[PDB]
Amino acid sequence: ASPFRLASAGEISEVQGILRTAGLLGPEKRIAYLGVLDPARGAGSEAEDRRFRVFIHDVSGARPQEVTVSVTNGTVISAVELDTAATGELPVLEEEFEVVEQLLATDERWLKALAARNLDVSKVRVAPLSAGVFEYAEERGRRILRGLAFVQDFPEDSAWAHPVDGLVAYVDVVSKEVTRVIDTGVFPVPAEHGNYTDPELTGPLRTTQKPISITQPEGPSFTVTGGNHIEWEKWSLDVGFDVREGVVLHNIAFRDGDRLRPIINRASIAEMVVPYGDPSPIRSWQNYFDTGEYLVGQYANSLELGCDCLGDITYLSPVISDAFGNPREIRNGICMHEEDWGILAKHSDLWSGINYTRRNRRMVISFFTTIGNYDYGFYWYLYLDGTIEFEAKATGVVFTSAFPEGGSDNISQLAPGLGAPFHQHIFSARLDMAIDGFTNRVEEEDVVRQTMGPGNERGNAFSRKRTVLTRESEAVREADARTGRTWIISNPESKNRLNEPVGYKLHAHNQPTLLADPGSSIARRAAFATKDLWVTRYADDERYPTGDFVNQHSGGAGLPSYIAQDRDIDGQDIVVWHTFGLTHFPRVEDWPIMPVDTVGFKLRPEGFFDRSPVLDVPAN
Amino acid sequence: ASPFRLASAGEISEVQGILRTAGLLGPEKRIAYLGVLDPARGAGSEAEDRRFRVFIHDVSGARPQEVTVSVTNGTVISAVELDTAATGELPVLEEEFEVVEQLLATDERWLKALAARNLDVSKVRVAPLSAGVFEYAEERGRRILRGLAFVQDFPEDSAWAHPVDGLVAYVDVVSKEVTRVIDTGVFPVPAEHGNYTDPELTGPLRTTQKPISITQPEGPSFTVTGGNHIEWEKWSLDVGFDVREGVVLHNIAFRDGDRLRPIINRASIAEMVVPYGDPSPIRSWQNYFDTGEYLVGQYANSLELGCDCLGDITYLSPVISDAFGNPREIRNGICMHEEDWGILAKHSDLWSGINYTRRNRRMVISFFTTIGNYDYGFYWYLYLDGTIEFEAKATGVVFTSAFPEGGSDNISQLAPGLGAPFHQHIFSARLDMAIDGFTNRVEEEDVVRQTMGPGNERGNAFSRKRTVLTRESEAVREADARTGRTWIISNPESKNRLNEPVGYKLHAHNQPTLLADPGSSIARRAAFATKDLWVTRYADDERYPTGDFVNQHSGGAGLPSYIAQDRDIDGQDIVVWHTFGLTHFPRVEDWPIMPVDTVGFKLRPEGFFDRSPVLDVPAN
Ligand SMILES: [Co+2]
Ligand SMILES: [Co+2]
């Protein structure tokens, strides 16, 4: 197919061979990350070179390596030793998840802690959480995991209902030593169960819901070719999948009559952090980079037809590598289908007597992932009118704690003695822009209020102002919902028929950005989350807003470093990074299982077309 | 039956008979407004008393009257003569619309202006628009409409493509006189047609859209009882319809186990204003109160099955009065149906091995109206989890002008020589709150950022603060998207099992509010649109944010006068008035017919329930 096709099990196997053959994949080596590389910048480059990037961990304690291999030419293009204390630790390995609980089970401090609380060690689940970087000097260079305890009364019990507060352990998962066990005091362990599948809790199930059937008697309107190439209602794109980012969209273009006009070169959620706002030492270090530290694509669910994806669905089953280089397929990991989207355009004209109504539709490309207690759905939508939209759906079980006697300013009560620490889920959408090609620029557009007086005697006038971001040093922008602030990405060398540079306007939800104090560790490690919009000059090695190795990285790694280059972004190959998230103060209705909460953003054509691009839609 | 039942044809004819019998409806009288009044406050309602309020116009020029009749008792409860120059003119009568073009067609000033542009008067359509209140002293006490011309080249031509700039006329529609004709100079009349059904413009219609069939084999899950009483997935409410407000929701409540718990006593879009931001004298007076001046409900479209409402739809055909008091039915004017809404809750738990997925659904109640070039869809949604949401959908044809040769700061170009003046579409949702009953209170909730230091040593803590609005004087609030500002309506006397007052949280979109200078006529007439949220103490005569008579009415009534009463709203029968709207800088993509743009708000339970209310939702 094209150089944008999904990785084959064969390519994964071929990467495994090349590595072992080069002596890079011994018995103590584990693949922490592996993913195909996107074709480099060009056009007439028919010579295909499928390369894969790999992060290799060594369970002995030896320095890890970043290796790039060429599957097309069975070679090791590069292999470098990483100084994790300098560049950060590799992504948390799924196999290290069990380790924290196992090591702790034989630690006397831990056992002493459980004994004081009368908790059976065999019933205490331990959540292997990322460590971050705080004041523990002995952690620099070491691969640390922190553990919080939750009691599971029985196999099918929801342990989240029973947090063991006042206790936290730090574990060196390489040397296998419990570096520390902190017990700040016994807290009552919440007793009510949160088993949402227990009839005693749910009550008799409803019998009132009649079925809703969504069918496509003639099949879907989109076509899938070359495995992942989508063609639908003038749109054209390639659906990729990466173990770290999940679903990635490539070459989003719109066929405007004769031309296939590019809009976005690459769209992905490049990072997703979940910072907690509880100042208790038991949790004050808690910040989960679901994408950067855990890798969201790795945990993508196999979606069941009729349950997760309703209607006429076309699935993609992406292949990833396991810790040993063996290919693993995520059956039905990606859903593709078109949804009716109500009214597109409507007008009943008195003067002409013409009554006109048209219906809208959206192409949907989604996947759902699970990172411990949270579950997130990632949805990309393409609309008939040219609008592109992203929506994240957050659900799962809330991360719990004990609810302090006397209340709390940073924790809310869900059940008797059960608390839910305040937190945020902040995303970063990386949009490698290609508005009618790569020569793009960004303008910040604000509504402009005008004062009543000469030229505006009735005081009714209002305008808009656009400020072009010319250098990266002036491309770190904040939201301003009050002045209806948006950002327009245009091609200054491609003009519509009214001789105006074609463009697309980004409409943000203007939700709060990172709340943490500016001098905090999380503010420095997830600096991208402190501002709504960033614009950088494209560079193939600038992939994530938080850098390539997020785990235990000290600070300032991604966007702040890239931006510091201060490159020219006025009419250049540029990338837009939009920060957007949810700020959560959990409610009683989020317990025992959370109903979906959503956030997103969208981009609408702004003088991109010469008139409405949906005049050819039939009466339907 | 239920005192909230829709008005029947018989009741309307009876109101006519009662007015006639009372000598209030002779041959010169016209009904400018007629609607049923809601049952009086309380509980011990001694039998049914269906009362209707009527605004009676006199075509001979005599003073109009406001009358309330008891259709049950066959009596006139009150009838007062109105001094329109003081209290405002009655809503525009449908019959007065055509009058503008008719009178102008024989006016020599108008004819000279047309001849100067070489336009055939028989092809010049005139958009009859509300006049507002400006410096025209002779207009005080008279019913005026202003006219803007558009050329219609042939019967089926869209005149909006051909605006005649530099010209405007004012007309007294009662005395049938053209009071003024202002010609500021000729502007080329845009030549390109905007005929969206002309194959020459649309091009060949797409053959790519495959059908999306949505069916309900066993029928809908909601039941319609007593004509307009709906019961669906624990929800209960009555769907009313008023000629001014359109769809109005009454007694929204949720059956939580044994108890039917009220949430919102009455919800409606109590006003909507469309102000224009072009300082040209030809349009600087332009502002319409589609609800208050035109009465959106009377222009509701008859919805076609399959095109307007897809799926298993249950229609209501509300009856309204014509200008003479005879009943008229808007066949299929309201659509009711439930629609699938993706994932409701989902969690795949490692520890328990339990994988759980549930789907969401929403009850939809909608209607679409058309007033001139604009068409608006009003949609109310009720979700399984207890969320209530409203969404307005703006479409139709953009109101045009000429595009100034040297560009414009207040008008955008759509086609060669065709301009689109900037404007807004601002709505006011009046929510008569009844959270678990009438004893309610409103708190403004802001996210609170904390400084790193003692008690927050790692600088990760963040909190929330709630400020109770105790008196109406402190109940006029603005948005603050940056601090995640929301407003919680609670019942200080009804606590959940965790001993917290039950409540609902209002999530606004935080769009810009009224942009006009504060000293402008529109800022005073649309004072409500200058702030995001208002809370008043309920009063039966405080129905609209702009007062009872908006047409050509200055400031002096509405919210600003109500609030001055400075009543107690801390644990009392209160009403929330939320302002939300769209700010439009028309795009080429909006021509020749605009794709739907949306805006709205939603309310989510906030400690209302004792745990998630959807644990009894069965697996698909
Ligand atoms: Co959350
Ligand atoms: Co508009």
| H/E element, B127 | strand B124-130
- Residue B136 corresponds to which tokens in the numbers above? 């025209």
d(CA A420, CA A423): 9
Residue whose C-alpha is closest to residue A521's, from A487, A554, A485: A554
- Give distance in angstroms: CA of B276 to centre of ligand 2: 10
Q: Where are the beta strands (DSSP E) in B154-234?
A: 167-172, 177-183, 213-215, 223-225, 229-232
> With contact defined as beta carbons under 8 Å apart, do B453 and B470 qualify?
no
What's the resolution in A? 1.8
CA–CA min distance B382, chain A (Å): 14
Pairing type for strands B287-289 and B259-275 reads: antiparallel
Q: d(Cα B104, Cα B170) in Å, to the nearest integer?
A: 9
Q: Is the CB of residue A321 less than 8 Å from the CB of residue A52?
A: no
**Environment class of residue B154 by beta-carbon count within 10 Å: exposed (0-12), middle (13-18) or buried (19+)?**
exposed
Q: Nearest-CA neighbor of B306 among B332, B283, B288? A: B332
Q: At residue A387, what is the residue type?
A: T
SS3 of chain B: helix, strand, coil, percent, to 5: 15, 45, 45
Give the residue from chain B lying closest to A384, CA to CA.
B595
- How far apart CA A127 and CA A142 sit, in angstroms, is 19
Structure tokens at A127: 């959540």
Q: How is residue A293 annotated by DSSP? A: I
Domain final residue pick, B161, B178, B195: B195
Q: How far apart are CA B570 and CA B572, in angstroms?
A: 6
What is the token pair recorded at B356? Answer: 């759980």
Catalytic-residue membership of B290:
yes
Q: Which residue bears the tokens 């001789």? A: A499
Cα–Cα nearest to A234, from B208, B200, B596? B208
CA A143–ligand 1 middle distance (angstroms): 27
Structural domain for A442, as ranges? 196-619
Residue A472: exposed, middle, or buried by beta-carbon count in 10 A (0-12, 13-18, 19+)?
buried
Half-sphere exposure of A180 (CA within 13 A, CB side): 14
Element housing A109 (H / E): helix A108-116
Nearest chain A Cα distance for residue B324, angstroms: 22
**Residue A155 vs residues A117, A128, A159, A199, B9: alpha-carbon distances, Å:** 21, 19, 9, 17, 64
Show Cβ contacts of residue B143 under 8 Å, excluding neighbours closer than 6 positions.
B89, B90, B96, B172, B173, B174, B551, B552
A291 is in an annotated binding site: yes
How deeply is A60 buried, as exposed, middle or buried, from its count of CB atoms within 10 A (0-12, 13-18, 19+)? Answer: exposed
Name B569's Cβ contacts closer than 8 Å, sequence gap at least 6.
B441, B442, B469, B470, B471, B472, B475, B535, B536, B537
What's the rounded Cα separation, in Å, for the pair B121 and B109?
12
Structure-derived torsion over alpha carbons of residues A540, A377, A241, A382, reported in degrees to the nearest 10: -80
Calculate the CA dihedral of residues B72, B74, B77, B82 and round it to 10 degrees: 120
DSSP H or E stretch at residue A524: helix A521-525
Closest CA to B262 of B48, B43, B563, B445: B43
Q: In what order do the strands lie in the sheet with A418-421?
A: A401-402, A418-421, A411-415
| Alpha carbon distance B97, B107 (integer Å) | 17
Judging contacts by C-beta atoms under 8 Å, the chain B residues touching residue A361 are: 209, 212
The structure tokens listed for B158 are: 């869209």
Q: What are phi and psi for residue A298, nearest 5 degrees? A: -55, -40
Alpha carbon distances (Å) from B110 to B100, B151, B168? 11, 14, 9
B324 is in an annotated binding site: no
Residue among B110, B3, B115 nearest B48 (CA): B3
Q: Which residues contact B405 (CB under 8 A, 6 or more apart)?
A: none
Ligand 1 geometric centre to CA of A424 (Å): 6
Distance from CA of B188 to the nearest CA of A (A): 17
> What CA–CA distance (Å, rounded) separates B429 from B407?
37
* Distance separating alpha carbons of residues B514 and B524, to the nearest angstrom: 11
Say yes or no: B36 and B106 in one domain.
no
Q: Which two tokens stand for residue A175?
A: 């040397």
A217 preceded by a cis bond (ω within 30 of 0): no
Same domain, residue pair A204 and A182: no
Name the residue among B343, B415, B590 with its Cβ closest to that of A308.
Answer: B343
Strands (E), A372-440: 374-383, 388-396, 401-402, 411-415, 418-421, 423-433
- B412 lies in the same domain as B363: yes
Work out how many CB contacts closer than 8 A connect A with B: 452
- Longest CA–CA span in chain A (Å) reads 86
CATH code, B487: 2.70.98.20
Q: Using an 8 Å Cβ cutoff, are B120 and B149 in contact?
A: no
Q: Is A481 helix (H, G, I), strand (E, B) or coil?
A: helix
Structure determination technique employed: X-ray
Option in B214, B218, B348 nearest A210 (CB) = B218
Residues linked to residue B533 through DSSP beta bridges, in sequence order? B477, B578
Could you give the CA distance from residue B512 to residue A480 in angstroms, rounded to a whole number? Answer: 10
State whether the Cα torsion B124-B129-B133-B139 is positive or negative: positive
CA distances from residue A554 to A84, B245, B461 in whole angstroms, order as listed: 10, 58, 20
Q: Is A292 helix (H, G, I), strand (E, B) or coil?
A: helix
Tell me the two tokens of residue A255: 């066929």
Catalytic residue among B290, B432, B548, B590: B290
Neighbours of ion ligand 1 (CB under 5 A): A 584
Q: Kindly give, in sequence order, each residue whose CB lies less than 8 Å from that of residue B555, ignoring residues fewer than 6 positions away.
A: B524, B525, B527
**Omega of the bond prior to B454 within 30 degrees of 0, cis?**
no
Report helix, strand or coil for B87.
helix
Cα–Cα distance, A551 to A561 (Å, whole number): 17
A584/A161 Cα distance (integer angstroms): 18
Instruction: Quote the DSSP letter at residue B499.
Output: S
Catalytic residue among B170, B374, B381, B538: B374
- Closest-CA distance of chain A to residue B175, Å: 25
3-state secondary structure of B14: helix
DSSP per residue, A71-93: TTTTEEEEEEE--HHHH-PPPPP
Determine whether B568 is an active site residue: no
Secondary-structure breakdown of chain A: helix, strand, coil percentages, each rounded to the nearest 5: 15, 45, 45
d(CA A413, CA A380): 34
User: Which of A195, A216, A237 marks a domain boundary?
Assistant: A195
Q: Which of B530, B508, B506, B518 is nearest to B424 (CA)?
A: B530
In the structure encoding, which two tokens stand for residue A64, read together?
């890890």
Question: What residues of chain B lie within 8 A of the CB of A203, using their CB?
Answer: 257, 615-616
- The token pair at A99 is 């380790």
Last residue of a domain, one of A195, A213, A243: A195
Greatest pairwise CA separation for chain B in angstroms: 86
Return contacts of A317-320, CB within 8 angstroms, 24+ apart: A318/A6, A318/A7, A318/A241, A319/A6, A319/A7, A319/A8, A319/A9, A319/A12, A320/A7, A320/A12, A320/A34, A320/A241, A320/A243
Give B548's DSSP letter.
S
Distance, CA of A570 to CA of A574 (rounded, Å): 9
Task: Give the torsion sign (CA, A318, A338, B375, B270).
Answer: negative
CB A368 within 8 A of CB A567: no
Question: Which residue, B465, B432, B405, B435, is CA-closest to B609?
Answer: B435
Q: Measured between alpha carbons, how far is A615 from B199 in angstroms, rounded to an integer?
A: 9
Euclidean distance between CA atoms B296 and B392, whole angstroms:
13
Task: Determine contact, residues B419/B413, Cβ cutoff 8 Å.
Answer: yes
Contact assignment for B512 to A452 by CB distance below 8 Å: no
Query: Residue B480 and residue A512: Cα distance in Å, rounded?
Result: 10
Residue (of B375, B129, B377, B336) closest to B246 by Cα position: B377
Residue B558 pairs in a beta bridge with none
Helix (H) or strand (E) holding B150: strand B144-151
Tokens of A149: 């305890």
Show Cβ contacts of residue B286 under 8 Å, excluding neighbours closer than 6 positions.
A460, B129, B132, B146, B275, B276, B278, B421, B423
**Residue B79: which CATH number?**
3.10.450.40
User: Would you say B349 and B355 are in contact if contact means Cβ atoms under 8 Å apart?
Assistant: yes
* Strand arrangement, sheet containing B355-371: B314-316, B334-348, B355-371, B374-383, B388-396, B594-605, B501-508, B486-495, B441-449, B462-469
Do both A159 and A235 map to the same domain?
A: no
- Residue pair A245/A297 in contact (Cβ under 8 Å)? The answer is yes
Name residue A309's beta-bridge partners: A305
Nearest Cα residue to B444 out of B472, B430, B464: B464
CA B267 – CA A485 distance, rounded (Å)? 30
Enumerate the β-bridge partners of residue A347.
A356
Q: SS3 of B544, please?
A: coil
Give residue A608's identity as a one-letter amino acid code: F
Closest CA to A193 of A160, A148, A223, A229: A160
- String of DSSP letters for B554-615: -SSSSHHHHHTT--B-TTBSEEEEEEEEEEE---GGGSSSEEEEEEEEEEEESS-SSS-TTT
Total domains in the fold of chain B: 3
Instruction: Spell out which residues of chain B touch residue A211, defining contact as CB-CB under 8 Å.
Output: 216-218
Question: CA geometry: angle at B91 spanning B86 and B94, to 5°?
Answer: 145
Q: Are residues B615 and B490 in the same domain?
A: yes
Query: Does A221 lie in the same domain as A120?
Result: no
Q: How many CB atoms within 10 Å of residue A497?
A: 12
CB contact under 8 A, B211 and A207: no
Based on the fold, state whether residues A280 and A327 are members of the same structural domain: yes
Same structural domain for residues B484 and B399?
yes
Cβ contact A209–B233 (<8 Å): yes
Do residues A535 and A574 lie in contact, with contact meaning Cβ atoms separated by under 8 Å?
A: yes
Residue contact B510–A342, C-beta within 8 A: no
Contact at 8 Å (CB) between A353 and A324?
A: no
Question: Are B236 and B279 within one domain?
Answer: yes
H helices, E strands: number in chain B: 7, 34
Q: Which of A219, A275, A457 sits opposite B210 (nearest CB)?
A: A219
- Is the separation of the CB atoms in B77 and B49 below 8 Å? no
Q: Which ligand is nearest to the CA of A596?
A: 1
| Residues A296 and A390 grouped into a single domain | yes
Does residue A200 sit in the same domain as residue A329? yes
> How far is Cα B99 from Cα B177, in angstroms, rounded to an integer?
10
What's the CA dihedral at A70, A76, A81, A82 to 10 degrees? 0
Neighbours of B616 (CB within 10 A): 17
Residues A37 and A124 in one domain: no
Strand B486-495 and strand B501-508: pairing? Answer: antiparallel
List residues of A with catalytic annotation: 290, 374
Distance of alpha carbon B495 from alpha carbon A588, whole angstroms: 12
Nearest CB partner across the interface for A385, out of B311, B520, B595: B595
Interface test with A, best of B235, B589, B616, B620 (most A CBs within 10 A): B589
